[PDB]
Amino acid sequence: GKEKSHINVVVIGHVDSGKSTTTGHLIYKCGGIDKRTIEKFEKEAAELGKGSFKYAWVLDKLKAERERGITIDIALWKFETPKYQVTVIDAPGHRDFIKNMITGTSQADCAILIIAGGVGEFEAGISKDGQTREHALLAFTLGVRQLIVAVNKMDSVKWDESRFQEIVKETSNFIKKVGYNPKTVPFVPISGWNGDNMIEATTNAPWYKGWEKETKAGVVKGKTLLEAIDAIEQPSRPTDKPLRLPLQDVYKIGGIGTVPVGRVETGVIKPGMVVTFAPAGVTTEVKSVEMHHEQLEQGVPGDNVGFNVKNVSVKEIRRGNVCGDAKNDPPKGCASFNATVIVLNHPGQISAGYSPVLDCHTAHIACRFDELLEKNDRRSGKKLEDHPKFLKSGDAALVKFVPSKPMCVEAFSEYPPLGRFAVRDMRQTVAVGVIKSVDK
Amino acid sequence: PAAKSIVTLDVKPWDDETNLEEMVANVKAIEMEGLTWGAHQFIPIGFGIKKLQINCVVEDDKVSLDDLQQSIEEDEDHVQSTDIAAMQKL
């Protein structure tokens, strides 16, 4: 039982791709979620014959049990690989997931695109207006640079090599148009239902020599999807960057006083540091830090911590403010910020003056699109025009935003979790933004 | 069948004295076509405060999570905020 590094993965794909069975199989065989339910159905499966059972049948029963509302575990799902503890999201088709993908915690280190191999199903999945392409575009935009492709339902096309090759070619075109370099992406032919190439290699495709990917140090090869996930590259965590801790809530506890709560996004928080809260600019000492039941010596990136501070009323700090270190690039409010905005498909056009609500870290503030500064080629960033008069679906543009209330944001290159945002309107996320400059 | 998602909501109280059983009773009394409440637990977050962590399963086309969060937050006597702890496709 070796010590593991933690990574986050998001699984995307069309409704007929089988991505839920595929993700569910990995969690079943390499994790421990809802295992009492799994055990009940493994035993029940004796009724189908004399004892044998398929994991896909148990997954089907687990799904129905979840639909009834009687399973116990929460929706935070994990599984292990030789190197990693993986936190995985089988992306919901829910339209409110878009904002959660942009501003939620746990942004992905790698996306896994599941493709149906069948002829009709494959084509339906690569539509330009489909939810799958929007998910891949959002991941690319947010800096998810690693991608694995799994071509599922290979049994339905009889494990035909030509079919796999034509899907690889067509999917390489699909992902290149989003922005990914196909040479860096493993293509794995799998059967999520029968287990081929999931955890163990298939015996149904003698032509299959394995997947490969180019990396900065060389070419990495494997056979299975579990090997492709273990091969994800270890991303550098922001432990040594300056503290940033957006507040989610602020409590007044009898005998303790003020207790802000939030996730450490960058840096580390420790008792005895002197922190500052922005947009207000209040400064104070951290008295103690707690998480779950333990008192901590330090809260590191990813920890959702409570901390007690003196001489700060709950009225002067609130959700959406950002705590950082007074002696290491303290956070500050801004007068405006300029960001690259990618407009998603939606029933409208954007002109200067538009003032929807933006969700950025834990802040929810309407911000004016004060000026449309440039229109750009999305993938390369090249300026196409100065001062476009309007933006339509698909456009990438540099926009100057002015917040309607005091707001603390950051450039995405410096502090990623405080530099990406969702723009809400018409009951949906209509655009995603990446902050490029801030006037503090 | 209709597309669904399983969501875990975090519902935060005002302090360490908020009546948590009332808080979860109020959430579970919310009825929306396509919404199924599931399991819940009260989880310490530090300093004696516990949040409610509750599962629900939603039909994507029928239940707005933005609206559900807003509805839960109308119980101002018990609830300070709500957040999505995690969500998955079913």
mmCIF file with all atom_site columns, C-alpha atoms in Angstrom, chain A residues 249-257 259 261 314, chain B residues 11-20 23 42-43 45-52 76-81:
data_model
loop_
_atom_site.group_PDB
_atom_site.id
_atom_site.type_symbol
_atom_site.label_atom_id
_atom_site.label_alt_id
_atom_site.label_comp_id
_atom_site.label_asym_id
_atom_site.label_entity_id
_atom_site.label_seq_id
_atom_site.pdbx_PDB_ins_code
_atom_site.Cartn_x
_atom_site.Cartn_y
_atom_site.Cartn_z
_atom_site.occupancy
_atom_site.B_iso_or_equiv
_atom_site.pdbx_formal_charge
_atom_site.auth_seq_id
_atom_site.auth_comp_id
_atom_site.auth_asym_id
_atom_site.auth_atom_id
_atom_site.pdbx_PDB_model_num
ATOM 1  C CA . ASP A 1 249 ? -18.949 31.670 5.172  1.00 0.00 ? 249 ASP A CA 1
ATOM 2  C CA . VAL A 1 250 ? -18.290 33.708 8.325  1.00 0.00 ? 250 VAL A CA 1
ATOM 3  C CA . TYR A 1 251 ? -19.459 32.556 11.772 1.00 0.00 ? 251 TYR A CA 1
ATOM 4  C CA . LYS A 1 252 ? -19.698 34.213 15.216 1.00 0.00 ? 252 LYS A CA 1
ATOM 5  C CA . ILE A 1 253 ? -18.964 31.489 17.815 1.00 0.00 ? 253 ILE A CA 1
ATOM 6  C CA . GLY A 1 254 ? -19.654 32.123 21.497 1.00 0.00 ? 254 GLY A CA 1
ATOM 7  C CA . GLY A 1 255 ? -16.381 32.015 23.423 1.00 0.00 ? 255 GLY A CA 1
ATOM 8  C CA . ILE A 1 256 ? -14.270 31.944 20.241 1.00 0.00 ? 256 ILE A CA 1
ATOM 9  C CA . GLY A 1 257 ? -15.336 34.999 18.218 1.00 0.00 ? 257 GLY A CA 1
ATOM 10 C CA . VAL A 1 259 ? -14.472 32.266 12.347 1.00 0.00 ? 259 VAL A CA 1
ATOM 11 C CA . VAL A 1 261 ? -14.349 29.428 6.584  1.00 0.00 ? 261 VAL A CA 1
ATOM 12 C CA . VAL A 1 314 ? -18.626 39.092 11.188 1.00 0.00 ? 314 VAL A CA 1
ATOM 13 C CA . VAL B 2 11  ? -26.090 23.592 3.784  1.00 0.00 ? 11  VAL B CA 1
ATOM 14 C CA . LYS B 2 12  ? -24.361 25.806 6.351  1.00 0.00 ? 12  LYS B CA 1
ATOM 15 C CA . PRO B 2 13  ? -25.950 27.089 9.554  1.00 0.00 ? 13  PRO B CA 1
ATOM 16 C CA . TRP B 2 14  ? -25.540 30.477 11.243 1.00 0.00 ? 14  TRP B CA 1
ATOM 17 C CA . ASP B 2 15  ? -23.602 29.204 14.248 1.00 0.00 ? 15  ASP B CA 1
ATOM 18 C CA . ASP B 2 16  ? -22.855 26.240 16.505 1.00 0.00 ? 16  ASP B CA 1
ATOM 19 C CA . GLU B 2 17  ? -26.295 26.612 18.145 1.00 0.00 ? 17  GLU B CA 1
ATOM 20 C CA . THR B 2 18  ? -28.464 26.430 15.021 1.00 0.00 ? 18  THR B CA 1
ATOM 21 C CA . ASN B 2 19  ? -31.129 23.691 15.286 1.00 0.00 ? 19  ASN B CA 1
ATOM 22 C CA . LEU B 2 20  ? -29.755 21.276 12.676 1.00 0.00 ? 20  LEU B CA 1
ATOM 23 C CA . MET B 2 23  ? -32.605 22.814 9.134  1.00 0.00 ? 23  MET B CA 1
ATOM 24 C CA . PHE B 2 42  ? -24.105 16.442 9.907  1.00 0.00 ? 42  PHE B CA 1
ATOM 25 C CA . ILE B 2 43  ? -20.359 16.957 9.438  1.00 0.00 ? 43  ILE B CA 1
ATOM 26 C CA . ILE B 2 45  ? -16.240 21.836 9.944  1.00 0.00 ? 45  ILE B CA 1
ATOM 27 C CA . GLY B 2 46  ? -14.343 23.093 12.993 1.00 0.00 ? 46  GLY B CA 1
ATOM 28 C CA . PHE B 2 47  ? -14.958 25.179 16.094 1.00 0.00 ? 47  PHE B CA 1
ATOM 29 C CA . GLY B 2 48  ? -18.097 23.227 17.006 1.00 0.00 ? 48  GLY B CA 1
ATOM 30 C CA . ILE B 2 49  ? -19.954 24.137 13.784 1.00 0.00 ? 49  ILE B CA 1
ATOM 31 C CA . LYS B 2 50  ? -21.485 21.306 11.754 1.00 0.00 ? 50  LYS B CA 1
ATOM 32 C CA . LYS B 2 51  ? -22.758 21.605 8.181  1.00 0.00 ? 51  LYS B CA 1
ATOM 33 C CA . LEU B 2 52  ? -25.545 19.503 6.675  1.00 0.00 ? 52  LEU B CA 1
ATOM 34 C CA . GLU B 2 76  ? -32.890 32.414 6.881  1.00 0.00 ? 76  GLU B CA 1
ATOM 35 C CA . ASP B 2 77  ? -33.570 31.438 10.463 1.00 0.00 ? 77  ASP B CA 1
ATOM 36 C CA . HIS B 2 78  ? -31.357 28.355 10.026 1.00 0.00 ? 78  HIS B CA 1
ATOM 37 C CA . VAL B 2 79  ? -29.331 28.667 6.812  1.00 0.00 ? 79  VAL B CA 1
ATOM 38 C CA . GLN B 2 80  ? -26.398 30.995 6.076  1.00 0.00 ? 80  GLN B CA 1
ATOM 39 C CA . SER B 2 81  ? -25.479 29.554 2.656  1.00 0.00 ? 81  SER B CA 1
#
